Every structure is written in structure tokens, then in C-alpha cells.
Amino acid sequence: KIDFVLSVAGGFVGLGNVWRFPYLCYKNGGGAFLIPYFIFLFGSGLPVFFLEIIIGQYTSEGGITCWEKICPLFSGIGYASVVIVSLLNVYYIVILAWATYYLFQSFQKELPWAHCNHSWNTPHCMEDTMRKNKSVWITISSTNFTSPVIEFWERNVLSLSPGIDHPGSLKWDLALCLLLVWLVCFFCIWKGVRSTGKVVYFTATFPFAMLLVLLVRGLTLPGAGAGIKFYLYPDITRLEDPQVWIDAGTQIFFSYAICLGAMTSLGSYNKYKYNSYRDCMLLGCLNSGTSFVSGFAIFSILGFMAQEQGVDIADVAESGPGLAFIAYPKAVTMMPLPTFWSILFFIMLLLLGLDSQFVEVEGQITSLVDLYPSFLRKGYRREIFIAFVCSISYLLGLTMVTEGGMYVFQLFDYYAASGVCLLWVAFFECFVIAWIYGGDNLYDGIEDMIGYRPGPWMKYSWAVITPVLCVGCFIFSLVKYVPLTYNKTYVYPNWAIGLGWSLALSSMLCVPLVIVIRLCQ
Numbered sequence: 001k002i003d004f005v006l007s008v009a010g011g012f013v014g015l016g017n018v019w020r021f022p023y024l025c026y027k028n029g030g031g032a033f034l035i036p037y038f039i040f041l042f043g044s045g046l047p048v049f050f051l052e053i054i055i056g057q058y059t060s061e062g063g064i065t066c067w068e069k070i071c072p073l074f075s076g077i078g079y080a081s082v083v084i085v086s087l088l089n090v091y092y093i094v095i096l097a098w099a100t101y102y103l104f105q106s107f108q109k110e111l112p113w114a115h116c117n118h119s120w121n122t123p124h125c126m127e128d129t130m131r132k133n134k135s136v137w138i139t140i141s142s143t144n145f146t147s148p149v150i151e152f153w154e155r156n157v158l159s160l161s162p163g164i165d166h167p168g169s170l171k172w173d174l175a176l177c178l179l180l181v182w183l184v185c186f187f188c189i190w191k192g193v194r195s196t197g198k199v200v201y202f203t204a205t206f207p208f209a210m211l212l213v214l215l216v217r218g219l220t221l222p223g224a225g226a227g228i229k230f231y232l233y234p235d236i237t238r239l240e241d242p243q244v245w246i247d248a249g250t251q252i253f254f255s256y257a258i259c260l261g262a263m264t265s266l267g268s269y270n271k272y273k274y275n276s277y278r279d280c281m282l283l284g285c286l287n288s289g290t291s292f293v294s295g296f297a298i299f300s301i302l303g304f305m306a307q308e309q310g311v312d313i314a315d316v317a318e319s320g321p322g323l324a325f326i327a328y329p330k331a332v333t334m335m336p337l338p339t340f341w342s343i344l345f346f347i348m349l350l351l352l353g354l355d356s357q358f359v360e361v362e363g364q365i366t367s368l369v370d371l372y373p374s375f376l377r378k379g380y381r382r383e384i385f386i387a388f389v390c391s392i393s394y395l396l397g398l399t400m401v402t403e404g405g406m407y408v409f410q411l412f413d414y415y416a417a418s419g420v421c422l423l424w425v426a427f428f429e430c431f432v433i434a435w436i437y438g439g440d441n442l443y444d445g446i447e448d449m450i451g452y453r454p455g456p457w458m459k460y461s462w463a464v465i466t467p468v469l470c471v472g473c474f475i476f477s478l479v480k481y482v483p484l485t486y487n488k489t490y491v492y493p494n495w496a497i498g499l500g501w502s503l504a505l506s507s508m509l510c511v512p513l514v515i516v517i518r519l520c521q
């Protein structure tokens with residue numbers, strides 16, 4: 001019970017609610033993102049999560065083992081999830097590397113991004129406190145100016161190249177930060193160091209307090225009403241593009257850590273005769289509320305920056321993966337004693353990232369050791385195996401810390417553990433569960449375990465709402481095609497789009513291979 005609650009709280013509350021949701025909501029106009037957000041929430045987000053928990057508790061297994069007894073022909077979902085989490089682990093730790101770099105740069109007397117008198121800055125820079133001044137406003141030369149935070153993030157941390165075709169030279173300091181984070185993760189996993197006893201009280205109450213104070217600071221900031229209006233009121237015409245629907249569905253499937261093979265094991269740890277339904281509903285509501293209030297804070301900050309800079313809200317930031325690193329460092333600057341609050345906030349980010357990183361990597365290593373235990377479970381191989389896995393992941397992720405490392409990271413974010421592959425996996429899971437096993441068969445088990453019969457809503461949500469949404473989104477995306485573009489102006493080469501589609505197809509095509517191999521034998 002207690003361990004279940006703590007593990008599930010640490011299993012999906014983290015970067016997916018604070019970093020990824022805000023920039024996807026910002027890129028799609030704001031309010032128009034919310035209607036598909038809630039539709040997909042109440043259609044599949046809670047039903048599929050509850051289905052995973054129930055199947056884990058019922059089979060007492062996870063990963064491929066549960067599908068090995070639910071449907072042998074449909075065991076490819078486990079392998080697809082393994083590939084998805086393996087590709088996700090590579091690019092999930094670059095955020096932690098950036099956080100470590102920011103934290104190390106925080107120890108100085110003055111924050112580096114508070115001004116742009118440094119040496120890594122273009123001549124087209126000035127301070128936001130007087131950017132709206134008449135001599136430096138729409139009167140003349142108001143289009144090519146830039147804020148110190150944008151220039152810092154684009155040059156000191158990234159040093160962005162003209163394109164992906166020009167990778168430049170490798171940056172060594174970010175490589176060292178990545179190595180340090182990987183070493184910390186290896187030390188934590190090898191010795192089995194997890195929060196226990198009374199320290200978990202602070203570990204759980206610190207991120208919420210930091211989020212609360214950040215929310216208060218953002219709400220008290222002038223010009224946040226425009227940000228709230230942008231975040232809430234939707235655009236009807238914008239809904240005619242499949243982009244909003246597909247990214248809302250993937251945000252639902254990502255924030256809840258669905259289709260990664262983790263919740264099945266989490267429910268497998270549970271025993272029979274437990275009320276999983278109430279806990280699952282409460283956790284889903286808590287996760288959604290946390291994301292909603294985090295969006296409040298982000299868009300209040302964005303509205304403040306848009307009001308102070310003099311430009312429109314739709315284009316005031318990167319509109320890409322690095323939205324948090326532009327909003328939050330700008331927010332922590334307004335607090336008294338900025339250094340202490342910056343250190344606290346980046347420690348909070350590190351804490352929210354490290355626990356999720358640990359649990360995902362541990363689940364991955366358990367999956368691989370279960371895949372071939374014959375000599376893995378015997379001897380001292382269970383240290384060198386993690387050593388090799390960490391080294392390979394570090395080498396693979398080293399390609400995203402070069403001069404042109406942002407484009408590869410954006411391609412990974414778009415095509416690796418999101419987009420069409422997650423919809424594919426969720427559609428297949430819902431289809432098999434609802435149509436081959438039978439909803440009545442699962443309600444029999446639910447009645448046996450929890451002693452009560454829920455309403456006739458899970459059956460519908462698994463039979464008619466999820467497959468229709470998945471198929472509609474896929475078909476409409478295929479019919480109306482718009483190629484991926486970093487930010488909004490950069491157009492990718494043909495081979496880059498081919499590589500991204502190959503990345504997605506690598507996860508997607510595991511299921512047909514499994515089916516054809518099972519049928520051939």
C-alpha cells in the first residue's frame with residue numbers, strides 16, 4: 001500500500017508534467033490543445049492505465065510475460081515498449097545534463113543569464129527591462145533584437161549550428177556533465193540506493209512546495225491574464241489539423257508513462273484483494289491537476305514575458321524543447337536572493353528527473369535480464385551488464401551535445417517515444433483486450449479481486465472510443481501531411497525525415513514481425 005503509493009507517485013510525476021506539456025501546448029496555439037487533451041484523457045488515459053494496473057495485478061507479471069498468457073500472437077507490444085523506453089532513455093538524460101550545467105553555472109555571484117555583456121553574445125542583444133523603450137521599439141529595428149536568456153540558451157549551452165547537416169565540433173563540458181549524471185545513476189542503481197524511512201517525506205513535499213511558490217510568483221506577475229486567456233480560450237479553426245489531436249494523445253500517453261511496460265510490473269507487485277480502482281482514479285486526477293497547474297504557471301510567465309518584450313504571445317520563446325529553460329530561469333530572477341531559489345529549483349528538477357531515470361533504467365535492465373537470464377542471473381555479470389548499458393547509452397547520446405545537437409534531439413523527441421508509435425501500441429492493446437479476451441472476462445476478475453462491479457464505462461472506453469480515435473488520428477495525419485520543422489522556420493532535409501521515420505518505424509514494425517514469426521512456425 002504505502003510502497004505502492006510512493007512508487008507510483010515517483011513513477012510518472014516529473015519532467016513530463018513540467019517540461020514537455022508546456023511547450024507542446026505552446027506550439028499548438030494554447031486553448032485549442034485542451035479540448036483534445038481532455039477528450040483523450042477521459043477516453044483512454046484513465047482506461048488504459050487502469051487496464052495496465054489490473055492486468056499486472058491479475059497476472060502478477062510484467063513486460064512480455066503478461067502478453068505471453070493473454071495472447072501469444074500479440075506479444076510484440078512488450079518488445080515495442082522495450083524499444084520505446086530504450087530510445088527514450090538516451091534523450092531523456094540530456095535534459096538532466098542541461099539542468100546540471102545550469103546548476104553549476106548557478107553558484108556564481110550573479111546569474112549568467114541576467115545580462116548579455118558576455119563574450120558569447122551577438123551584437124543584436126539588449127535587456128528586457130528597457131527593450132520596450134521607444135528608441136529600441138517598433139519605431140526601428142524591433143524585429144532582429146534578442147533577449148539575454150534566448151542568446152544564452154542558444155549559444156553558451158547549445159552553440160546552435162546553421163543546420164543538422166553541419167554538426168560542428170563536440171562540446172566537452174556537456175559531455176562531462178552527461179558522464180557525471182550517468183555515473184551518479186550507476187552508483188545509485190548498483191548499490192540499490194532508494195529513498196526510504198523518513199527522508200521520503202522531504203523528497204515528496206519539496207517538489208510540491210517549490211511548484212506552489214513558483215505558481216504564486218507567476219500568478220502575482222503582471223500581464224498573466226493574457227497568458228491565462230491564451231492558455232484557456234480555444235481556437236476552433238485550428239482543430240482541423242491532425243497535429244493538435246496527435247500531440248494531445250501523445251501527451252496523455254507520455255505523462256502517464258503508458259505503453260512503457262512499467263505500470264504492468266507496478267501492478268504485478270500488488271497482490272489480490274486490493275482496491276486498485278480508487279487509487280488509480282485518484283492518481284490520474286492528481287497527475288492531471290499537477291499538469292494543469294504547471295501549465296497555469298508556465299503560461300503566466302509566458303504572458304509576462306510577452307507583455308514586457310513588446311511582441312505577441314505566439315512567438316516570444318523557442319517554441320521547442322527548451323521552453324522550460326527559458327521560462328523558469330526568467331522566473332527565478334524576480335525572486336529575492338535569486339541564487340538560492342535558482343539552486344533550489346534546479347535541485348528540484350534533478351530530483352524529479354533522477355527518480356524517474358532510476359526506475360526506468362531499472363525496469364529496462366530487469367526486462368533485458370529476463371529476456372536471457374541463463375548466464376545473466378548467475379555470477380558477477382550483473383555489474384558489467386549495467387556498466388556496458390550505461391556506456392553504450394552515453395556514447396549514443398554523445399551525438400546530441402555537439403554544435404548541431406538540438407536538431408537530433410528534436411527528431412528523437414518527435415519520432416522516438418511519441419507520435420504514431422504510441423498510438424499504434426495503445427490501439428493494439430485496447431483492441432486485443434476488448435475484442436479477443438472479452439470485457440466480461442475481465443469484469444469477472446475485477447469482481448473477484450476488488451469485490452465490487454464498476455459502471456459500464458471501461459467496456460465502452462476499450463471498445464469504441466479508443467480505436468476510433470486512434471484510427472481517425474492516423475488516417476487524418478496521413479491524408480493531410482505536414483513535414484516536421486524544427487521551431488517554425490527550419491526545414492529538414494529529405495534524408496533527415498527519412499531517418500526520423502525509420503526511427504519511428506523501428507518501434508512500430510516489431511508487432512508484424514512477431515505476428516509473422518509466430519504464424520510461420
Ligand SMILES: CC(C)CCC[C@@H](C)[C@H]1CC[C@H]2[C@@H]3CC=C4C[C@@H](OC(=O)CCC(=O)O)CC[C@]4(C)[C@H]3CC[C@]12C
Pocket residue numbers: 082083086087371506
Ligand atoms: C537503440 C535500439 C535500436 C536498440 C535495439 C535493441 C534492443 C531494443 C534489444 C531489446 C530486446 C532485445 C532482443 C531480446 C531477445 C532476442 C532474442 C535472441 O535472438 C535469438 O536468438 C532468437 C531466438 C531466441 O529468442 O533466443 C537474442 C536477440 C534478441 C532478438 C534481442 C535483440 C536486441 C533487442 C531487440
Ligand SMILES: CC(C)CCC[C@@H](C)[C@H]1CC[C@H]2[C@@H]3CC=C4C[C@@H](OC(=O)CCC(=O)O)CC[C@]4(C)[C@H]3CC[C@]12C
Pocket residue numbers: 164165166167396399408
Ligand atoms: C544506433 C542506432 C540507434 C542508430 C542511431 C543513429 C543516430 C542516433 C545517429 C548515429 C550517427 C549519426 C550521424 C553521424 C554524423 C552526421 C554528420 C552529418 O552528416 C553529414 O551529412 C556530414 C557531411 C560532411 O561532414 O561533409 C549530419 C548528421 C549525421 C549524419 C548524424 C545524424 C544522427 C546519426 C545517424
Ligand SMILES: CC(C)CCC[C@@H](C)[C@H]1CC[C@H]2[C@@H]3CC=C4C[C@@H](OC(=O)CCC(=O)O)CC[C@]4(C)[C@H]3CC[C@]12C
Pocket residue numbers: 079083502503505506507510513514517
Ligand atoms: C527496419 C529499420 C527501421 C531498422 C530497425 C532496427 C531494429 C529496431 C530492429 C531490427 C531487427 C529487429 C528485431 C528482429 C526480431 C525480433 C524478435 C521478436 O520476437 C520473436 O520473434 C520471438 C521472441 C524473441 O526471441 O525475441 C521481437 C522483435 C525483435 C526483437 C525485433 C526488434 C526490433 C529490431 C531489433
Ligand SMILES: *[C@@H]1O[C@H](CO)[C@@H](O)[C@H](O)[C@H]1NC(C)=O
Pocket residue numbers: 117
Ligand atoms: C561590460 O564588460 C566590460 C568588460 O568586459 C566592461 O568594461 C563594461 O563596463 C561592461 N558594461 C556593463 C554595462 O556592465
Ligand SMILES: *[C@@H]1O[C@H](CO)[C@@H](O)[C@H](O)[C@H]1NC(C)=O
Pocket residue numbers: 129130132133134
Ligand atoms: C529609455 O531610455 C532613457 C534614456 O536613458 C531612460 O531615461 C528611460 O528610463 C528609458 N525607458 C525605460 C522604460 O526604461
Ligand SMILES: *[C@@H]1O[C@H](CO)[C@@H](O)[C@H](O)[C@H]1NC(C)=O
Pocket residue numbers: 124141143144145
Ligand atoms: C536589424 O534590422 C535589419 C533587419 O533586416 C538589419 O538589416 C539590421 O542590420 C539590424 N539592425 C540592428 C541595429 O539590429
Ligand SMILES: [Cl-]
Pocket residue numbers: 016017021251252255291
Ligand atoms: Cl500533461
Ligand code: NA
Pocket residue numbers: 009010011012013014015352353355356
Ligand atoms: Na518521477
